[PDB]
Amino acid sequence: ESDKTFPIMLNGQVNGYACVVGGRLMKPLHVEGKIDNEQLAAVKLKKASMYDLEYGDVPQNMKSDTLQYTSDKPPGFYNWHHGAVQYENGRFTVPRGVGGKGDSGRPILDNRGRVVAIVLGGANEGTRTALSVVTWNQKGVTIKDTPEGSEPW
Amino acid sequence: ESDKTFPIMLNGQVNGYACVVGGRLMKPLHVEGKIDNEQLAAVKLKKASMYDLEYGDVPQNMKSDTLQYTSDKPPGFYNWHHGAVQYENGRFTVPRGVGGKGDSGRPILDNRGRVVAIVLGGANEGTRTALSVVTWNQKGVTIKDTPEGSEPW
Amino acid sequence: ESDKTFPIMLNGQVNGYACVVGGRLMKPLHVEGKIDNEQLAAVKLKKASMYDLEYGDVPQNMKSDTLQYTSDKPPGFYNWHHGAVQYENGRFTVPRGVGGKGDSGRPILDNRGRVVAIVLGGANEGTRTALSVVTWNQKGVTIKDTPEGSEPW
Amino acid sequence: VIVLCGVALAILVGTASSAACIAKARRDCLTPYALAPNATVPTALAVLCCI
């Protein structure tokens, strides 16, 4: 997590956490700031606004150091920078009150250090918090899954 | 001191210091240089030229933690970055030789950790060195002191 | 070596080395990149294109902090950042295989710590590798010694 | 002169609208596959809208 997840800086504040996966950087469109890495600041970000994201191609040096996409997501506990995340009923949820603004772009991690979803927001349903995320599909489709009442952090 | 006192840098050399007091940032006018801090660099500085100072409102995310000030000045020794300054006869005297260029904008602290004045320069009286500073007053007043021969550091 | 030898950045990668000798800063011309030192970034470079080098006058603080040159070159082994280099038959040679692209501008030292030459490239004979470097002469003459088949690193 | 200029303007606006719609359709139908590995794309869409 720490080695290859570069915060986005603005006004002396971290606004999110851009992630480089499969040789491409991803950054949530709704969030604003600058990337600390000078190299990533020189990448042209193509915007997929329907997914609330922009992507660009990482440079040649950094190609070898990126997180891995995934497709298989058995329901259960998954790794996270703030702990563990529960996946059930095709939905991701976290203990209520954990996370918030400035945490966008945080990757949900699998046991083998593979990325499962990217955090965009959270909806509070009282008992837990439902994560609005972008997920993969068996046909290699990056589905943006956002429960009702999701708030983009 | 170390946490909340910011060097002023020019051409890769530290040539000054800016201080935050009472929710406001101040800086020596005579010195030219950037401020590395993003928000302070983004602060609009209203310049009081006869005071040889510019003041700017510190942003809200760090206005909570700012140096406290004082007006009471009992005579005696006062701690400071390069040791202790003797305050007597309305004058900040320091042992001869101590200090020089680049020490402008260093706060003078109290024993209870309170800012009393900001040094601008110094003039060797012979066995000691008189500090030209910006003292405050009990009537809510701020007075620049420039001992005859005061040298802008 | 480590203090007075600086890296050149190319997209955030090392691609050569700049050497400070006698208060003047040299950098290979074929190697393109930015000097890591901000001070050296402000030095204007005039180019000796036929020598494939650019030299500039270092600022006043590092004019003393520099490598010392020398002209006496008895044949034998000489120091090098990657190990030992052989000066034989008026030729600088290294074991075949060590060194390559990005090693341009590496200084060649003397045992007492003085500089004798600066490496620019190499050509492989199969048994050893002959380095195309710049060598100084008893008459204070700098020959750019390039063996046949020299390739700029 | 007015009639010819109007015909030219209508042709220009029709072409501009068609180009914008085509480029938005390319974006829409390609960006999901560009954020994922192993884009098994039926190549008709790319071949149509690459030119």
Short mmCIF file of C-alpha atoms in Angstrom, two decimals:
data_model
loop_
_atom_site.label_atom_id
_atom_site.label_comp_id
_atom_site.label_asym_id
_atom_site.label_seq_id
_atom_site.Cartn_x
_atom_site.Cartn_y
_atom_site.Cartn_z
CA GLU A 1 0.00 0.00 0.00
CA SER A 2 2.59 2.46 1.22
CA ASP A 3 5.12 1.86 -1.56
CA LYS A 4 2.90 2.35 -4.60
CA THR A 5 0.00 4.59 -3.60
CA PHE A 6 0.83 8.26 -4.05
CA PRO A 7 -1.38 10.84 -2.32
CA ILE A 8 -2.78 13.81 -4.18
CA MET A 9 -1.75 17.04 -2.46
CA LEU A 10 -3.57 20.35 -2.32
CA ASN A 11 -3.30 23.32 0.04
CA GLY A 12 -1.11 21.25 2.33
CA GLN A 13 -3.87 18.63 2.51
CA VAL A 14 -4.13 15.13 1.11
CA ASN A 15 -7.31 14.81 -0.92
CA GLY A 16 -6.96 11.23 -2.11
CA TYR A 17 -4.72 8.35 -3.13
CA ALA A 18 -4.02 7.76 -6.81
CA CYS A 19 -3.19 4.17 -7.77
CA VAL A 20 -1.14 2.66 -10.61
CA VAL A 21 -2.59 -0.65 -11.80
CA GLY A 22 -1.67 -2.70 -14.85
CA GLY A 23 0.61 0.06 -16.11
CA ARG A 24 -1.99 2.80 -15.80
CA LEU A 25 -2.70 5.42 -13.15
CA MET A 26 -6.23 6.06 -11.89
CA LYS A 27 -7.53 9.12 -10.04
CA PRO A 28 -11.14 10.00 -9.06
CA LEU A 29 -12.48 12.83 -11.19
CA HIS A 30 -14.54 14.47 -8.44
CA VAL A 31 -11.41 15.05 -6.34
CA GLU A 32 -8.99 17.93 -6.93
CA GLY A 33 -5.33 18.50 -6.10
CA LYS A 34 -1.83 17.75 -7.32
CA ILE A 35 0.10 14.49 -7.40
CA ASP A 36 3.28 14.55 -5.32
CA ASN A 37 5.27 12.49 -7.82
CA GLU A 38 6.70 14.72 -10.53
CA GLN A 39 6.53 11.88 -13.04
CA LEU A 40 2.83 11.31 -12.47
CA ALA A 41 2.32 15.07 -12.79
CA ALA A 42 3.61 14.72 -16.37
CA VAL A 43 1.02 12.13 -17.41
CA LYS A 44 -1.96 13.16 -19.53
CA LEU A 45 -5.16 12.09 -17.80
CA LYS A 46 -7.94 10.88 -20.09
CA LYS A 47 -11.26 11.29 -18.29
CA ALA A 48 -13.93 8.60 -18.12
CA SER A 49 -16.54 10.77 -16.42
CA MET A 50 -19.18 8.05 -16.55
CA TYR A 51 -16.90 6.16 -14.16
CA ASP A 52 -15.82 9.33 -12.28
CA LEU A 53 -12.20 8.65 -13.12
CA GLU A 54 -9.25 9.61 -15.28
CA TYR A 55 -6.44 7.34 -16.39
CA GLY A 56 -3.01 7.70 -17.92
CA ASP A 57 -0.05 5.57 -18.90
CA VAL A 58 2.69 5.22 -16.30
CA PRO A 59 6.27 5.90 -17.46
CA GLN A 60 8.73 3.24 -18.49
CA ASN A 61 10.57 3.16 -15.16
CA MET A 62 7.41 2.57 -13.12
CA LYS A 63 5.83 -0.09 -15.35
CA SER A 64 7.30 -2.94 -13.31
CA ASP A 65 5.93 -1.57 -10.02
CA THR A 66 2.13 -1.58 -10.18
CA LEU A 67 -0.69 -3.37 -8.44
CA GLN A 68 -2.52 -6.20 -10.16
CA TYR A 69 -6.07 -6.16 -11.49
CA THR A 70 -8.32 -9.05 -10.53
CA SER A 71 -11.62 -10.62 -11.43
CA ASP A 72 -12.43 -13.33 -8.90
CA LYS A 73 -14.05 -11.89 -5.77
CA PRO A 74 -15.47 -14.48 -3.38
CA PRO A 75 -17.65 -12.83 -0.73
CA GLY A 76 -15.86 -12.36 2.55
CA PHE A 77 -13.22 -10.22 4.18
CA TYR A 78 -10.83 -8.19 2.04
CA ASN A 79 -7.78 -6.16 2.95
CA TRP A 80 -7.77 -2.39 3.36
CA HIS A 81 -5.50 0.37 4.57
CA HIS A 82 -7.89 0.99 7.46
CA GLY A 83 -8.41 -2.72 8.07
CA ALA A 84 -10.80 -5.32 6.65
CA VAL A 85 -13.81 -4.82 4.39
CA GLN A 86 -16.83 -7.12 4.17
CA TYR A 87 -18.08 -8.22 0.75
CA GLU A 88 -21.58 -9.70 0.65
CA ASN A 89 -24.63 -9.73 -1.61
CA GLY A 90 -22.54 -8.14 -4.34
CA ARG A 91 -21.84 -5.18 -2.06
CA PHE A 92 -18.85 -3.87 -0.13
CA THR A 93 -19.30 -2.62 3.41
CA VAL A 94 -17.12 -1.37 6.25
CA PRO A 95 -17.65 -0.64 9.94
CA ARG A 96 -19.67 2.52 10.39
CA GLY A 97 -17.59 5.68 10.81
CA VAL A 98 -14.31 4.36 9.39
CA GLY A 99 -12.86 6.30 6.47
CA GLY A 100 -14.06 9.54 4.95
CA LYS A 101 -13.08 12.45 2.76
CA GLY A 102 -9.46 12.39 1.66
CA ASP A 103 -9.66 8.59 1.41
CA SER A 104 -10.83 8.43 -2.22
CA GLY A 105 -8.78 6.24 -4.49
CA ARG A 106 -7.82 3.87 -1.70
CA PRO A 107 -7.58 0.34 -3.16
CA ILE A 108 -9.36 -2.56 -1.55
CA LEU A 109 -6.81 -5.36 -1.35
CA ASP A 110 -7.01 -9.12 -1.68
CA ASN A 111 -4.96 -11.63 0.30
CA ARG A 112 -2.44 -12.07 -2.53
CA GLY A 113 -1.85 -8.33 -2.75
CA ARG A 114 -4.19 -7.89 -5.72
CA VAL A 115 -6.61 -4.97 -6.11
CA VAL A 116 -10.32 -5.76 -6.00
CA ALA A 117 -11.97 -2.34 -5.93
CA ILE A 118 -11.11 1.35 -5.69
CA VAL A 119 -12.85 3.43 -3.05
CA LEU A 120 -14.87 6.34 -4.40
CA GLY A 121 -17.27 7.05 -1.56
CA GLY A 122 -19.27 5.64 1.30
CA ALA A 123 -22.96 5.45 2.15
CA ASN A 124 -24.05 5.23 5.78
CA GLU A 125 -26.94 2.79 6.21
CA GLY A 126 -26.91 3.12 10.00
CA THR A 127 -25.36 -0.19 11.01
CA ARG A 128 -22.39 -0.23 8.63
CA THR A 129 -21.11 1.90 5.75
CA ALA A 130 -21.62 0.77 2.15
CA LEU A 131 -18.71 1.52 -0.19
CA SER A 132 -19.32 3.08 -3.59
CA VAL A 133 -16.52 1.53 -5.65
CA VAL A 134 -15.48 0.42 -9.11
CA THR A 135 -15.26 -3.34 -9.55
CA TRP A 136 -14.22 -5.74 -12.28
CA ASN A 137 -16.32 -8.31 -14.10
CA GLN A 138 -15.75 -11.85 -15.33
CA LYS A 139 -15.69 -10.49 -18.89
CA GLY A 140 -13.06 -7.95 -17.84
CA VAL A 141 -15.50 -5.06 -17.45
CA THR A 142 -14.75 -2.44 -14.82
CA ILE A 143 -18.16 -1.99 -13.21
CA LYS A 144 -18.67 1.11 -11.08
CA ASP A 145 -20.87 -0.16 -8.21
CA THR A 146 -22.40 2.61 -6.10
CA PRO A 147 -25.18 1.90 -3.57
CA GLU A 148 -27.98 4.38 -3.02
CA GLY A 149 -27.01 7.31 -0.84
CA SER A 150 -23.32 7.01 -1.69
CA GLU A 151 -21.30 10.13 -0.97
CA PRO A 152 -18.12 10.72 -3.00
CA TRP A 153 -15.42 11.25 -0.42
CA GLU B 1 10.13 26.57 18.13
CA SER B 2 11.07 23.93 15.61
CA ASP B 3 7.52 22.93 14.68
CA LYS B 4 6.06 26.38 14.10
CA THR B 5 8.96 28.54 12.88
CA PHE B 6 9.55 28.47 9.15
CA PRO B 7 12.84 29.28 7.45
CA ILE B 8 12.81 31.63 4.49
CA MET B 9 14.75 30.26 1.53
CA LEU B 10 16.24 32.00 -1.49
CA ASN B 11 18.49 30.45 -4.16
CA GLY B 12 18.78 27.32 -2.06
CA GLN B 13 20.00 29.27 0.95
CA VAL B 14 18.01 30.02 4.07
CA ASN B 15 18.18 33.79 4.46
CA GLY B 16 15.27 34.52 6.80
CA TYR B 17 12.52 33.14 8.98
CA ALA B 18 8.79 33.76 9.03
CA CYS B 19 6.73 33.36 12.18
CA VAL B 20 3.09 32.65 12.96
CA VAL B 21 1.66 34.48 15.97
CA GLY B 22 -1.91 34.99 17.13
CA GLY B 23 -3.38 33.44 14.02
CA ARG B 24 -1.33 35.59 11.67
CA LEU B 25 1.83 35.02 9.68
CA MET B 26 4.53 37.67 9.61
CA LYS B 27 7.78 37.98 7.72
CA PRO B 28 10.74 40.38 7.51
CA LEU B 29 10.24 42.86 4.70
CA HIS B 30 13.95 43.36 3.97
CA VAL B 31 14.46 39.67 3.23
CA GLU B 32 13.60 38.31 -0.21
CA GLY B 33 12.76 34.63 -0.60
CA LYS B 34 9.94 32.16 -1.01
CA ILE B 35 8.06 30.43 1.78
CA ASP B 36 8.06 26.68 1.24
CA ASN B 37 4.66 26.23 2.86
CA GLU B 38 1.89 26.09 0.28
CA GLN B 39 -0.79 28.01 2.16
CA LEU B 40 1.58 30.67 3.45
CA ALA B 41 2.77 31.07 -0.14
CA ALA B 42 -0.92 31.39 -1.03
CA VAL B 43 -1.60 33.90 1.76
CA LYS B 44 -2.13 37.49 0.63
CA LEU B 45 0.40 39.67 2.46
CA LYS B 46 -0.63 43.19 3.43
CA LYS B 47 2.62 45.13 3.64
CA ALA B 48 3.28 47.71 6.37
CA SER B 49 6.42 49.26 4.95
CA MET B 50 7.34 51.51 7.86
CA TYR B 51 7.06 48.51 10.17
CA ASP B 52 9.28 46.53 7.74
CA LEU B 53 6.75 43.70 7.90
CA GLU B 54 3.95 41.93 6.05
CA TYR B 55 1.16 40.12 7.85
CA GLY B 56 -1.25 37.54 6.51
CA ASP B 57 -4.19 35.64 7.97
CA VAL B 58 -3.18 32.03 8.59
CA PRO B 59 -5.61 29.47 7.10
CA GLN B 60 -8.19 27.77 9.25
CA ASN B 61 -6.70 24.27 9.30
CA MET B 62 -3.71 25.58 11.25
CA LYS B 63 -5.08 28.71 12.92
CA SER B 64 -5.90 26.54 15.94
CA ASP B 65 -2.20 25.86 16.58
CA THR B 66 -0.33 29.16 16.41
CA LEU B 67 2.16 30.92 18.65
CA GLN B 68 0.77 32.90 21.54
CA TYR B 69 1.89 36.46 22.16
CA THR B 70 2.39 38.69 25.16
CA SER B 71 2.88 42.32 26.08
CA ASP B 72 4.37 41.98 29.57
CA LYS B 73 8.16 42.33 29.52
CA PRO B 74 9.80 41.90 32.91
CA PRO B 75 13.52 42.67 32.68
CA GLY B 76 16.10 39.90 32.72
CA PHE B 77 17.35 37.11 30.51
CA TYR B 78 15.15 35.82 27.70
CA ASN B 79 15.66 32.56 25.84
CA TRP B 80 16.09 32.59 22.08
CA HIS B 81 17.34 30.46 19.23
CA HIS B 82 21.03 31.15 19.85
CA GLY B 83 20.83 31.25 23.64
CA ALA B 84 19.51 34.02 25.85
CA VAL B 85 18.90 37.70 25.23
CA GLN B 86 19.23 40.20 28.07
CA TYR B 87 16.37 42.72 28.19
CA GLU B 88 17.16 45.96 30.00
CA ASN B 89 16.55 49.69 29.59
CA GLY B 90 13.96 48.99 26.92
CA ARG B 91 16.65 47.30 24.85
CA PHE B 92 17.38 43.72 23.87
CA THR B 93 21.11 43.23 24.35
CA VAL B 94 22.90 40.06 23.31
CA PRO B 95 26.53 38.99 23.82
CA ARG B 96 28.77 40.50 21.17
CA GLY B 97 29.29 38.39 18.07
CA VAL B 98 26.23 36.16 18.41
CA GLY B 99 23.98 36.31 15.35
CA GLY B 100 24.22 37.83 11.91
CA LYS B 101 22.62 37.71 8.48
CA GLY B 102 19.87 35.14 8.06
CA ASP B 103 18.65 35.36 11.66
CA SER B 104 16.02 37.98 10.87
CA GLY B 105 12.47 37.01 11.72
CA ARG B 106 13.46 34.80 14.61
CA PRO B 107 10.92 35.16 17.44
CA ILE B 108 12.04 36.09 20.93
CA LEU B 109 10.40 33.68 23.33
CA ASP B 110 9.37 33.94 26.95
CA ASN B 111 10.10 31.37 29.63
CA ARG B 112 6.40 30.42 29.46
CA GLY B 113 6.70 29.92 25.72
CA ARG B 114 5.18 33.20 24.61
CA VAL B 115 6.34 35.48 21.81
CA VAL B 116 7.29 38.98 22.86
CA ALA B 117 9.12 40.49 19.86
CA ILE B 118 10.65 39.74 16.46
CA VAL B 119 14.28 40.58 15.75
CA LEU B 120 15.14 42.45 12.57
CA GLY B 121 18.83 43.22 13.06
CA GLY B 122 21.66 43.92 15.50
CA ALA B 123 24.29 46.59 16.30
CA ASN B 124 27.42 45.70 18.36
CA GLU B 125 27.60 48.17 21.31
CA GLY B 126 31.18 46.97 21.99
CA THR B 127 31.02 44.23 24.66
CA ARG B 128 27.45 43.26 23.56
CA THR B 129 25.13 43.64 20.51
CA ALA B 130 21.89 45.64 20.54
CA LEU B 131 18.96 43.96 18.79
CA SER B 132 16.62 46.03 16.64
CA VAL B 133 13.26 44.33 17.22
CA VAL B 134 9.50 44.88 17.09
CA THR B 135 8.18 45.15 20.64
CA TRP B 136 4.56 45.42 21.71
CA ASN B 137 2.93 47.65 24.30
CA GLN B 138 0.34 47.42 27.03
CA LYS B 139 -2.06 49.70 25.15
CA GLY B 140 -2.36 47.25 22.28
CA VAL B 141 0.51 48.89 20.42
CA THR B 142 3.48 47.56 18.46
CA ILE B 143 6.67 49.62 18.38
CA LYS B 144 9.67 49.06 16.16
CA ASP B 145 12.96 49.60 17.96
CA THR B 146 15.99 50.40 15.79
CA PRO B 147 19.00 51.22 18.00
CA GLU B 148 21.24 53.80 16.34
CA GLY B 149 23.33 51.90 13.82
CA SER B 150 20.83 49.04 13.65
CA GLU B 151 21.86 46.71 10.85
CA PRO B 152 19.18 44.81 8.92
CA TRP B 153 20.16 41.17 9.20
CA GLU C 1 33.52 10.94 -4.51
CA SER C 2 29.99 10.63 -3.22
CA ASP C 3 29.71 14.25 -2.05
CA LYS C 4 31.29 15.87 -5.10
CA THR C 5 29.75 13.62 -7.77
CA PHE C 6 26.18 14.46 -8.69
CA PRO C 7 23.42 12.59 -10.53
CA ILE C 8 21.71 13.72 -13.69
CA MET C 9 17.97 13.14 -13.85
CA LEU C 10 16.27 11.98 -17.04
CA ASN C 11 12.54 11.56 -16.40
CA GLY C 12 13.60 10.71 -12.86
CA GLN C 13 16.34 8.27 -13.85
CA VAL C 14 20.11 8.52 -13.61
CA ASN C 15 21.63 8.81 -17.07
CA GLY C 16 25.04 10.31 -16.29
CA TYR C 17 27.17 12.12 -13.76
CA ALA C 18 28.43 15.67 -13.43
CA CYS C 19 31.86 16.22 -11.92
CA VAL C 20 33.10 19.35 -10.17
CA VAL C 21 36.80 19.91 -10.78
CA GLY C 22 38.76 23.02 -9.86
CA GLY C 23 35.70 25.18 -9.37
CA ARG C 24 34.28 24.35 -12.80
CA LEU C 25 31.36 21.96 -13.42
CA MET C 26 31.46 19.58 -16.38
CA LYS C 27 28.64 17.53 -17.85
CA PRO C 28 28.64 15.25 -20.90
CA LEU C 29 26.89 16.75 -23.90
CA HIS C 30 25.45 13.51 -25.28
CA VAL C 31 23.84 12.79 -21.90
CA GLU C 32 20.64 14.82 -21.59
CA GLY C 33 19.03 15.45 -18.22
CA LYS C 34 18.66 17.76 -15.25
CA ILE C 35 21.32 18.14 -12.54
CA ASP C 36 20.08 17.11 -9.10
CA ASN C 37 21.65 20.15 -7.42
CA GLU C 38 19.42 23.19 -7.65
CA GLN C 39 22.47 25.44 -7.51
CA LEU C 40 24.08 23.69 -10.45
CA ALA C 41 20.76 24.02 -12.27
CA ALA C 42 21.38 27.78 -12.25
CA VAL C 43 24.84 27.46 -13.82
CA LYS C 44 24.94 28.51 -17.47
CA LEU C 45 26.72 25.95 -19.65
CA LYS C 46 28.87 26.75 -22.67
CA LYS C 47 29.41 23.76 -24.93
CA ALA C 48 32.59 22.38 -26.45
CA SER C 49 30.70 20.31 -28.98
CA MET C 50 33.77 18.65 -30.45
CA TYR C 51 34.71 17.48 -26.94
CA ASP C 52 31.10 16.34 -26.27
CA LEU C 53 31.18 18.20 -22.98
CA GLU C 54 29.88 21.36 -21.36
CA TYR C 55 31.63 23.24 -18.59
CA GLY C 56 30.53 26.05 -16.33
CA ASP C 57 31.87 28.11 -13.48
CA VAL C 58 30.55 26.75 -10.19
CA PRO C 59 29.26 29.27 -7.64
CA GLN C 60 31.48 30.70 -4.95
CA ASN C 61 30.50 28.35 -2.09
CA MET C 62 31.61 25.16 -3.92
CA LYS C 63 34.63 26.66 -5.77
CA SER C 64 36.70 25.28 -2.83
CA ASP C 65 34.48 22.16 -2.43
CA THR C 66 35.75 20.51 -5.67
CA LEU C 67 37.82 17.54 -6.97
CA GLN C 68 41.50 18.23 -7.65
CA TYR C 69 42.91 17.44 -11.09
CA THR C 70 46.24 15.82 -11.86
CA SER C 71 48.46 15.22 -14.86
CA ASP C 72 50.96 12.54 -13.82
CA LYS C 73 49.85 9.21 -15.28
CA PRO C 74 52.19 6.30 -14.66
CA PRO C 75 50.75 3.12 -16.16
CA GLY C 76 48.91 0.79 -13.85
CA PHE C 77 45.70 0.46 -11.90
CA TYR C 78 43.51 3.42 -11.02
CA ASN C 79 40.45 3.88 -8.85
CA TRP C 80 36.88 3.91 -10.10
CA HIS C 81 33.39 3.98 -8.64
CA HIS C 82 32.75 0.50 -10.00
CA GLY C 83 36.20 -0.76 -9.05
CA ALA C 84 39.60 -0.58 -10.72
CA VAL C 85 40.49 0.70 -14.17
CA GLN C 86 43.69 -0.18 -15.99
CA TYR C 87 45.75 2.51 -17.72
CA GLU C 88 47.93 0.60 -20.17
CA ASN C 89 49.41 1.36 -23.59
CA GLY C 90 48.00 4.84 -23.17
CA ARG C 91 44.55 3.25 -22.91
CA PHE C 92 42.00 3.07 -20.11
CA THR C 93 40.50 -0.39 -19.78
CA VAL C 94 38.13 -2.30 -17.50
CA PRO C 95 37.07 -5.95 -17.31
CA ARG C 96 34.72 -6.67 -20.18
CA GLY C 97 31.14 -6.37 -18.95
CA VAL C 98 31.19 -3.81 -16.15
CA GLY C 99 29.85 -0.37 -16.99
CA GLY C 100 27.38 0.74 -19.60
CA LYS C 101 24.77 3.31 -20.53
CA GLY C 102 24.24 5.91 -17.82
CA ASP C 103 27.84 5.67 -16.59
CA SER C 104 28.95 8.64 -18.69
CA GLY C 105 30.56 11.47 -16.73
CA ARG C 106 31.83 9.15 -14.01
CA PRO C 107 35.16 10.50 -12.70
CA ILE C 108 38.31 8.38 -12.70
CA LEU C 109 40.29 9.00 -9.52
CA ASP C 110 43.86 8.73 -8.35
CA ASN C 111 44.88 6.91 -5.19
CA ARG C 112 45.38 10.20 -3.34
CA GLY C 113 41.90 11.25 -4.43
CA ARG C 114 42.68 13.42 -7.43
CA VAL C 115 40.99 13.14 -10.82
CA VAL C 116 42.84 11.87 -13.86
CA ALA C 117 40.08 11.46 -16.46
CA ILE C 118 36.33 11.46 -17.08
CA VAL C 119 34.65 8.48 -18.75
CA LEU C 120 32.45 9.00 -21.79
CA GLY C 121 31.99 5.59 -23.39
CA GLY C 122 33.43 2.17 -24.06
CA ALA C 123 34.32 -0.23 -26.84
CA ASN C 124 34.59 -3.99 -26.33
CA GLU C 125 37.52 -5.91 -27.80
CA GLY C 126 36.16 -9.16 -26.36
CA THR C 127 38.92 -9.61 -23.79
CA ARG C 128 38.48 -6.18 -22.18
CA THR C 129 36.56 -2.95 -22.68
CA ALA C 130 38.42 0.19 -23.73
CA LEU C 131 36.92 3.39 -22.36
CA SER C 132 36.54 6.49 -24.49
CA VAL C 133 37.41 9.17 -21.92
CA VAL C 134 39.04 12.58 -21.71
CA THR C 135 42.68 12.50 -20.59
CA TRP C 136 44.98 15.36 -19.67
CA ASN C 137 48.55 15.76 -20.83
CA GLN C 138 51.88 16.88 -19.47
CA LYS C 139 51.54 20.02 -21.54
CA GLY C 140 48.17 20.58 -19.89
CA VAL C 141 46.37 19.31 -22.99
CA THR C 142 43.03 17.51 -22.75
CA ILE C 143 42.69 14.86 -25.47
CA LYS C 144 39.30 13.23 -25.88
CA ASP C 145 40.62 9.67 -26.19
CA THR C 146 38.07 7.58 -28.09
CA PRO C 147 39.11 4.08 -29.20
CA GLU C 148 37.66 2.75 -32.43
CA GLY C 149 34.10 1.60 -31.97
CA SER C 150 33.54 3.80 -28.93
CA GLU C 151 29.90 3.98 -27.88
CA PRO C 152 28.76 6.88 -25.66
CA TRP C 153 27.29 5.47 -22.48
CA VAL D 1 -25.40 33.80 -52.02
CA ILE D 2 -27.56 33.38 -48.92
CA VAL D 3 -28.90 30.02 -50.11
CA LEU D 4 -25.45 28.63 -50.85
CA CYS D 5 -24.07 29.88 -47.54
CA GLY D 6 -27.00 28.29 -45.72
CA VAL D 7 -26.38 24.96 -47.44
CA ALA D 8 -22.71 25.13 -46.49
CA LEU D 9 -23.57 25.95 -42.87
CA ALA D 10 -26.04 23.06 -42.71
CA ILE D 11 -23.44 20.64 -44.08
CA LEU D 12 -20.81 21.93 -41.65
CA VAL D 13 -23.08 21.66 -38.60
CA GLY D 14 -24.28 18.20 -39.62
CA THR D 15 -20.72 16.95 -39.97
CA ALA D 16 -19.68 18.52 -36.66
CA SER D 17 -22.61 16.93 -34.83
CA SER D 18 -21.89 13.54 -36.39
CA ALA D 19 -18.22 13.75 -35.41
CA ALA D 20 -19.08 14.69 -31.81
CA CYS D 21 -21.60 11.86 -31.52
CA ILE D 22 -19.14 9.34 -33.00
CA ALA D 23 -16.33 10.42 -30.68
CA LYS D 24 -18.61 10.23 -27.63
CA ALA D 25 -19.74 6.76 -28.71
CA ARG D 26 -16.09 5.68 -29.05
CA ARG D 27 -15.31 7.07 -25.59
CA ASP D 28 -18.35 5.36 -24.08
CA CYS D 29 -17.76 1.99 -25.74
CA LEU D 30 -13.99 1.90 -25.23
CA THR D 31 -13.08 3.45 -21.87
CA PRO D 32 -14.44 0.48 -19.84
CA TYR D 33 -12.23 -1.85 -21.84
CA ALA D 34 -9.23 0.50 -21.59
CA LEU D 35 -9.28 0.34 -17.78
CA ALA D 36 -9.14 -3.47 -17.78
CA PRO D 37 -6.77 -6.16 -19.05
CA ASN D 38 -7.41 -8.39 -22.05
CA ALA D 39 -9.78 -6.22 -24.09
CA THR D 40 -11.63 -8.85 -26.16
CA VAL D 41 -13.36 -6.15 -28.18
CA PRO D 42 -15.37 -6.98 -31.31
CA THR D 43 -13.21 -4.94 -33.64
CA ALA D 44 -16.05 -3.54 -35.77
CA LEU D 45 -16.55 -0.51 -33.51
CA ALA D 46 -12.86 0.41 -33.41
CA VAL D 47 -12.40 -0.19 -37.15
CA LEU D 48 -15.46 1.96 -37.89
CA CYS D 49 -14.54 4.86 -35.62
CA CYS D 50 -10.73 4.82 -35.86
CA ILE D 51 -10.77 6.90 -39.06
#
